């Protein structure tokens, strides 16, 4: 297929991660944010996938992005130097990498929201979407090497992974 179909990798997950629904749905047992990765790694081309927010209780900062296979699994994505992510609450997002917060953007998530992640190895960049609108500027501009889709979240969030998608501009 022109699109990639994948699920989360149970072998990538922190022990507190709960995978369900053919490894397409994830939550966590802990108040602490924990990581899971996609099973398919990307190193070239352009790839888009989405997360649907099934549950968003209280005001946590789940994170979405890409990571190396050896990213820290027990902390928010982007606390270490092996993930590039957007974290977002009900109000606003930030981008994070190496414990550096950048490009705060107004607008957040709620139950039913969609988060899109556009990983572009030809432009070496990473762009985020919320509800089919670009969230902030291009987040990062030195994308290279092998990356896996990545999520971090805690017990206040559940998300479902949607793959088999083309790039956001594919139609119309």
Residue numbers in the entry: 533 to 704
Text lifted from the article:
The tripartite motif (TRIM) proteins form one of the largest subfamilies of RING-type E3 ubiquitin ligases, comprising more than 80 members. About two-thirds of human TRIM proteins feature a PRYSPRY domain, also known as the B30.2 domain, in their C-terminal region.
For example, we observed a unique 11-residue deletion between β-strands 2 and 3 in the phylogenetically more closely related family members TRIM9 and TRIM67. Compared with the recently determined structures of TRIM7 PRYSPRY with a peptide substrate or a peptidomimetic ligand, the putative substrate-binding site in the structure of the two phylogenetically closely related family members TRIM9 and TRIM67 was much shallower. This was largely, but not only, due to a distinct orientation of the β5/β6 loop. In TRIM9, this methionine, Met608, packs against Tyr619 on β-strand 6. That this was seen in both the TRIM9 and TRIM67 structures suggests it is an intrinsic property of this loop in these two closely related homologs, rather than being induced by crystal packing.
